[PDB]
Design an enzyme around this catalytic site. Structure first.
Site, short mmCIF file in Angstrom:
data_model
loop_
_atom_site.label_atom_id
_atom_site.label_comp_id
_atom_site.label_asym_id
_atom_site.label_seq_id
_atom_site.Cartn_x
_atom_site.Cartn_y
_atom_site.Cartn_z
CG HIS A 94 -1.92 -1.13 1.23
ND1 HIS A 94 -3.18 -1.08 0.67
CD2 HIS A 94 -1.80 -2.37 1.77
CE1 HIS A 94 -3.79 -2.23 0.85
NE2 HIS A 94 -2.97 -3.04 1.52
CG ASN A 96 -8.00 -3.72 2.01
OD1 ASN A 96 -7.29 -2.76 2.31
ND2 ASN A 96 -7.49 -4.90 1.65
CG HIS A 152 -15.72 -15.09 -2.05
ND1 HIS A 152 -16.36 -15.40 -0.87
CD2 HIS A 152 -16.55 -14.25 -2.72
CE1 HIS A 152 -17.52 -14.77 -0.82
NE2 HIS A 152 -17.66 -14.07 -1.93
CG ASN A 154 -19.39 0.82 -0.51
OD1 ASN A 154 -19.62 1.98 -0.83
ND2 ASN A 154 -20.21 -0.19 -0.81
CD1 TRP A 191 -20.17 -13.38 8.50
CD2 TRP A 191 -20.77 -11.89 10.06
NE1 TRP A 191 -19.28 -13.48 9.54
CE2 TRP A 191 -19.62 -12.58 10.51
CE3 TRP A 191 -21.32 -10.90 10.88
CZ2 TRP A 191 -19.02 -12.31 11.74
CZ3 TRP A 191 -20.73 -10.63 12.10
CH2 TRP A 191 -19.59 -11.33 12.51
#
Ligand code: NDP
EC number: 1.11.1.6
Lengths: 499, 499, 499, 499
Positions: free
Chosen positions: C72, C145, C191, C210, C300
């Site tokens: 980063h 993140n 994923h 976001n 979730w």
């Protein structure tokens, strides 16, 4: 003629007389034409930056030092070997115990605990006795002291202990109120305090003291079976101590007494050696052990857990450049070869992180590439790359990620750890009230004779008298909690020392 | 099949196909039994300290980076040799020119100037072209550019110039106002600025560009006689440039265009080479040279000082680990063997201090102990000791002071410098007004043709349009001071770009 | 006139028009008489060491850099406040959530991941989104993140992943074979790989994305009751993405696009803001959860665990100096005030050691004493002393050990940690084959539409085609395992891409 | 009751009795709930990683230390003021000498030379007496010793002289052969060795020795006229010396004698002070001086050059944290305000570089921003930026380049250096054979009395007897070169010491 140490330069010349001296160069290999006069514009004119010869040499002079060790700063070093004499292969599969007659190169660094680089060698203080084994399973560091126990048993109190054994943060002076305020608020120190103020608190050099792992460790054989063990290495040159009055003369007469003793010893052929014993406890014995078997302020008595011999430590070589080969030595209790493992001892559990952590700061991120620290009998291959002052090929063009389809190194399943089952709340358990006087009682009554008990109280009292009275009163009480005559002698002396 | 640089791991696996993969070990040479799963309590429990395999790797990962170069940070590297072809011993005694056919290993680094580590290679900039000669009199570092000149001619402005060519301290963006406020306040930049924006501001990789030392230097011969000199090494692959259109496509289609190009060329056997020349000025030519002959914004015209061939540079080897061999390289202009000496050039005099200085910060006090930085074809011997990360025997027990009566290295009188005479006040002299237009006016009119002058103007206006009007107005005056039409063309384009 | 960023130097002068320029000094406060001409014996003579004004400035310019972040490294920053709009004191007792309306200062830094300091902002990668709350109870570093998940679920794999994303050790080139040899040997990456090559891989500035805590954490209210939670902060400006065609143009038309968007927005009053949400999972729901609730490749679902709002994040202030306020920032996930605690996530557990470690190496031992890393709203008081670059009084003459009887800081028993019971073997459990495809299948089918599945497959093949075939055939298999049409599409596009 | 230095903690607690102890926090401002016991799995379990309380504090402890000064490592510090009492403005314009009664804050550090951090204070060795004046024109460091002279007169000999005075590179032991092989090879050291081995080689602490600037320095007045001067600061408490017999007793009874003597004094209002004189030599008198007026081994006799008072130095404040106010203290001879300049002295010219060079190593690149090093009576402004551990604004968003049309700091023309004319060949002039005896013969005969000559020899013989015979013979000869009876008395005592 003088002792061998004094003549060091004398011999370096004679060992060289057959040659011509080397050409004097810069660090970049450039020959120097004059290195006693600076380049100036006129005899009494100023200096030019064209004089890089001066900046080359002076620049490095300004960077000669590094940080001294936060503890055990003042040290001596030597090199030798370890040799297996008895069979403990049922206990450990470690290659360093493979067969009888097997030798392993070692390195040793003695030290005190509190004093900085320039302090004296004959003072009251524990003595470091750290040993490094260069095995074909990678290095094994057994970072011991001259005592089988310590002053505390939780690693979170260690920095505070050290601060209470060193200088006051305003005056920079040794402060009795700091030493004893702690010891009397933490009576688990009563055992190691009784060892420290005994005669062996000041050893007459490094060759006349024993070493001890002190920590409980774990051994794992070739079936996958485990036992807990203590390590003892005893001096084959016999315990021998300085008296208070002699130690004090040599403290200004020869600040480097233990450093000169150990160098001359090896230089005159007198090779000091130590005998390595272990105690063994089973896992079962470890559940019935009256005390906590992982309490560093507890010894396993000899009658129940006798000493099993293993091998000999021998020191037969001096260092050639003290800095390169002693000051830069870095011992990790986390360096453990398959077959040796840690116990749950809290103190040892802290040392697993602390030592590597401080070595990246004191020496550098790639300190393990320094020659004395390198595992030069092991093939170091992984996926670790880069870092300051990178000194090998950096492992060349090998794939630097794991797992990979290009045949870089792989894991060796037979080196996995021993599996133990633990259960209990994840929580901070208060270990300040484990037994703090039982073993100490035995030491005072059954190990020492009456003269040694007599001196013990005079050495304590000669140092606790400077503390404030409410600290005294609280330390004395902790000594009566060992044996009422222990404290009421100390008190009788303090009663005098307070005029 | 693909280009060879893409097949690196492929070939690495092939050259290893026979033997077995290594054992994966800790930095300590201890084998690991599993390095894809951490030591936890339970399959869904926390991580333990005991997991020293995780700490050892993650600790070093945390310590991969070192401070990039403060300038010339984007680099490519390669290695090869220098070979003498002609005889220039009448001018220099430097062993590296001792006889024809004598080779000397070299190392090279190509770089830009302003971009950071991840910037594109195909941008408008000067290019580094630093060469390190590993000679028997210690290393020789010819650190040049792809230009015979630079923007300024007194070091004290160098930090300022660089700050103006990098990122605004608040917005951290490239700032045209910073760029052109300096360039227009310091017109001595007119000569190098002209060069920069022409066709050779964007070369087609590093194999199609010339290399110059730019400074004037001093050669010394075996009689102690001395002449000044310039270093040119000209590309034997031909000057070839990229268009603005083709640069701005590759700038995102392959940021590492140059890097790749050099690697692939060498791998396929297509070895680049440069022809080293020198110019020779006598001391008495230096007193009648119309300009200041140590002015770094000036060249020595060919008609009066022709090019004298010396030898060949040849690159025939790729690095194995880019970090250890290219990123840790350190070039110091002050690494000069007997025969080569500095001029009084104000800009060179500051590079004598700066480079060893910055290398002690970026790499380490003992950075000359890094292999690719080692003078491995000389004998380093001297009275420097210790310093963090010492990597040899630290010179052994050799006497560490000088003079001595024990035969430590000695000084070689033949390596004394040449003695010049200087007389003058010790003050700060103003060099802002040495002729800043003459040699440029020649360049614009006599060197460039119609089409090149057109392209030189557009490129300048294309980048000078985003600065404020008072900055454009001053810059155009300085250009008009070189040639009226120069300013008129730029000014015409600016009137358009300003809508 | 131009955008506010470009006019930074213009506005700095205007804001000072009324004052006189300061006096230029050395770092020692000594005024300088001349800093444009070096101190030399005569106009054309050598530079002197007496010229301290040059060395004092060249010495500090040689030490300007520090190590960039190991990951980063490229980032943008701003400052603002967190404000509580809803009540979640039943879950967490943290003083940042105390009552509705309460503001806490924050410091955010946006980032990419792999590209070094000079790489482009508009490239396919994840985006960092770190948030530093300055609480009265000490800092709180929510180091999130722009995605809820990650590519791996064991910290030990972390150095490997990174090394595969960055540069080949030999060619210093982004290596496709290293990227997908990793991803295809580790199919838990499925994923997050499908997130990255989807439209949100390239956000249109840092205001249109976001931010997620990603990790499960623990909250603890005042009664001692704890739950598990997920922190989502969602952009109030709307999700907005760039197309592969526009993101490549900008990558050379403005490599610092996001850096310029964040500054310009703020400067014009258009302050960006986010909405902080939490999910909540009770200790009993975790036990039954179909997947491992601390798996970092998992989310979730919203229907089962819907978003609870907490407050607002607003950014409303640009950094005045980029280095001291953004480059020197240091977020430690370990910085957690009472009421917020870690879950047993293997990746988080790793991140509790990582961040303080590297911040000592990158900035220094006392990095927390940098003003921007200061907990300047809490009162730091303890027994830590000394270190390099010690900047305050060092807590004065206070007693530096604990315990003591001289009234130095005391612990706060309310601030203990929540106690959990764990039980199991201490060993390295294998998580490699936890469900790898399910939640990806749901994402491919239900969240995307027909178009987006098309673009996801062109992006994957566009970059995977450069790998080796045997690495392609494996990745596609892992993609078939999510859905036969997933990997069949990818395989069709690859069939053409291989001519 | 005891001395003030031991009651330090007693008064701290007493000075706080009203208020309640602070909350013990982490470095991050987080309160801890228990810092005596470590987070484990069951009371006899292993340590965790999420015990960030243990890691946070230990990691700092592992970094408590920095490098010790390469010389003058043992020291004691105090703060007070300097007051003017006479008008020397006709020689100097420096703001510190503006008008009578002008005060300025000072800081002083005393030290020995060869001992490290732990050594004893009552040993034979010179004494540092460094003074930092915080004047409006920045800081004025006057880095003086307790002698007017030094052992050498070229800076290229310093690293070697220090090497000989420290520890053998193999034995780590003080090596009398190294000591006198150097001194007997460089007889310039005759003058200062005779001071060293007289009674003033061991002072009775730091309140009873004089201070001197040793080097000839330049003064410049407001008209632009210069003179060469010496600085003498004599003790208003009286010269007072320890005998060889007590100095040894105290070297084990109280290793920190001088440090306690200073603190206890100040803490009891008995403040020590010193009287600052100067000597003055015009430029004309410099041309005729019998020796070299810049020879560090030569004093200016009082009868030709009398002392001119100036003012007083007074120490009326103790440090509150030794480390943060005394160990991080950085004195640079180059910190010189307008009015005061260096003289051509070959040894001072090297200190103009050496100290800033070692303070960037020992402490760091920004060691001037450390409070006690800050020129906090002056306003630092310039164009130097960044660096490790940058602690203020970094001068904000001001322009970082010079010159600029944006009103950043400007140069102050009156602060320009005095112009001196030097003419002569640029080379390396030999200064070994400057008069090495004349002023010594004066001292021995005319300054010492019968008794003092006797002890001077005894002190010398005791230490020289341990050196080889061939080194003795050469030393004595250099003491016969001063006066036949000088080398005679020494040879009659060496005859006895060699049995
Ligand atoms: N002239 C000077 O600047 C100094 C000279 N000297 C020595 O004095 C000799 C003659 O100088 P001159 O001025 O002509 O004669 P002076 O008698 O005028 O100077 C005598 C100085 O000797 C110093 N002194 C006394 N005992 C000792 C000692 N044990 N170690 C060192 N210094 C001591 C005193 O310093 P004080 O009384 O000031 O404490 C006194 O100022 C010189 O050759 C030099 O060796 C020594 C110091 C200063």
């Amino acid at each position: 003629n003088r002792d061998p140490a004094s003549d060091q330069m004398k011999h370096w010349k004679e060992q060289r007389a057959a040659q011509k001296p080397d050409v004097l160069t810069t660090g970049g290999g450039n020959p120097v034409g004059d290195k006693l006069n600076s380049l100036t514009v006129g005899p009494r004119g100023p200096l030019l930056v064209q004089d890089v010869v001066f900046t080359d040499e002076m620049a490095h002079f300004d960077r000669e030092r590094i940080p001294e060790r936060v503890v055990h700063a003042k040290g001596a070093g030597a090199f030798g070997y370890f040799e297996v004499t008895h069979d403990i292969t049922r206990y450990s599969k470690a290659k360093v115990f493979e067969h009888i007659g097997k030798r392993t190169p070692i390195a040793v660094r003695f030290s005190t605990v509190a004093g900085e680089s320039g302090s004296a060698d004959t003072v009251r203080d524990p003595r470091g006795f750290a040993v490094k084994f260069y095995t074909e399973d990678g290095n094994w560091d057994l970072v011991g002291n001259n005592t089988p126990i310590f002053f505390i048993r939780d690693a979170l109190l260690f920095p505070s202990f050290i601060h209470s054994q060193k200088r006051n943060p305003q005056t920079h002076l040794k402060d009795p109120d700091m030493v004893w305020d702690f010891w009397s608020l933490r009576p688990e120190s009563l055992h190691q305090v009784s060892f420290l103020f005994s005669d062996r608190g000041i050893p007459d050099g490094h060759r006349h003291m024993n070493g001890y792992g002190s920590h409980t460790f774990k051994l794992v054989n070739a079936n996958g079976e485990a036992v807990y063990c203590k390590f003892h290495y005893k001096t084959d040159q016999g315990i021998k101590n300085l008296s208070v009055e002699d130690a004090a003369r040599l403290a200004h007469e020869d600040p480097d007494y233990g450093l000169r003793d150990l160098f001359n010893a090896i230089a005159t052929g007198n090779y000091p050696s130590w005998t390595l014993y272990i105690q063994v406890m089973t896992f079962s014995e470890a559940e019935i052990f009256p005390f906590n078997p992982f309490d560093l302020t507890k010894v396993w008595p000899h009658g129940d857990y006798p000493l099993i011999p293993v091998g000999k430590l021998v020191l037969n070589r001096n260092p050639v450049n003290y800095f390169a080969e002693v000051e830069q030595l870095a011992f990790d209790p986390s360096n453990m070869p398959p077959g040796i493992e840690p116990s749950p001892d809290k103190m040892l559990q802290g040392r697993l992180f602390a030592y590597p952590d401080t070595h990246r700061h004191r020496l550098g991120p790639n300190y393990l590439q320094i020659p004395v620290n390198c595992p030069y009998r092991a093939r170091v291959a992984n996926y670790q790359r880069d870092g300051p002052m990178c000194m090998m090929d950096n492992q060349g063009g090998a794939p630097n990620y794991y797992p990979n389809s290009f045949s870089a190194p792989e894991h060796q399943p037979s080196a996995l750890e021993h599996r133990t089952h633990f259960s209990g709340d994840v929580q901070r358990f208060n270990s300040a009230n484990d037994d703090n006087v039982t073993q100490v009682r035995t030491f005072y009554l059954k190990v020492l004779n009456e003269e040694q008990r007599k001196r013990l109280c005079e050495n304590i009292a000669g140092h606790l008298k400077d503390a404030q009275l409410f600290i005294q009163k609280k330390a004395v009480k902790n000594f009566s909690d060992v044996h009422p005559e222990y404290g009421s002698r100390i008190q009788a002396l303090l009663d005098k020392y307070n005029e």
